[PDB]
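Objective 1b. Sequence-to-structure analysis of Choline kinase alpha.
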Amino acid sequence: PEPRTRRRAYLWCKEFLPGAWRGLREDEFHISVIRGGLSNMLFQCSLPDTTATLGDEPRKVLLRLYGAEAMVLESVMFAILAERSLGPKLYGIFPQGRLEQFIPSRRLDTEELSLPDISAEIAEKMATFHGMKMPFNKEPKWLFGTMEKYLKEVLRIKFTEESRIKKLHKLLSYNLPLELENLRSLLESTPSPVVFCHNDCQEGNILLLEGRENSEKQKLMLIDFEYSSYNYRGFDIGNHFCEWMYDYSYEKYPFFRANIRKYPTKKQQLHFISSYLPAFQNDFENLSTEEKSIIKEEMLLEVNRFALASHFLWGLWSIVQAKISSIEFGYMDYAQARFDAYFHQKRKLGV
Ligand SMILES: Nc1ncnc2c1ncn2[C@H]1CC[C@@H](C(=O)Nc2ccc(S(=O)(=O)C(F)(F)F)cc2)CC1
């Protein structure tokens, strides 16, 4: 970072954080980039090793700059999740960004989502997240409201470059407005409890906590709640299952691989929900084998139907990003991949 912003960040840390941060000079302030870009930039700020801690205060903190009533809701949500220890602590909030607890950890990779212990804990963390009471609108308008929003943007897109017109053209040929109504119809007739959903539960949004790699059941934290809202539970689980097929670490264009064969098997899904249901309804454990098994089979139909909305939603989303995003990513190919998966899943389900 340039000297002007380095100023900004020094002051935030000095003005907002307790103990040693308070009596610290500009010439003892360490900050380096974690993630650059023009939106949601991340930086680690730290004390010198030479400087002694006074009280509770942390040695490292993460600074997050927004870059680019939405802010009120996200801030409140983040504060609340920090109070309940479900997210990183919140140390500072200001117009340009926030200071949060730095969680020593790494992101999971796509392959890890299928490891039984990992999958089981995600299901447990997700169930916990789904139990949160939040001061937000409890009507499930997010999913279809967001899909309509992006669809309407998609119909207005026009591309200057030539290959992009052809790609958009193939996508528009599916009759997106009509297909959206097909989806709504299917989902309106699929019962799914409304709950506080993460809405974006992918490997890059799950941290594996340092020094807990040997723990069986408490080694992960869910992060990045920008899309979170009251939603059908089926979406969050179906969305997460879709995320087994996609790997965003791929180092060449289009900067992702899709592997349709990596969608969880019946067995792997059952592994996930068998960890989910006990964690979401505490007395589920005490049902009869028969009653448990009826609930589980029903739940598989549910999440596999909702997985269609994941394909449809991120497909549309991805067309819009191709237009407006600064990030280096093959959006249009990703959109085609999500729609291919959408039509494949309808075939699999017989819808
Ligand atoms: N509160 C949080 N919210 C979202 N993500 C978080 C949070 N806390 C941690 N993380 C991820 C953890 C894993 C990962 C990470 O640590 N990356 C990273 C860390 C440090 C550097 S560096 O400063 O250049 C270094 F090399 F160390 F010197 C560069 C990159 C990304 C950040």
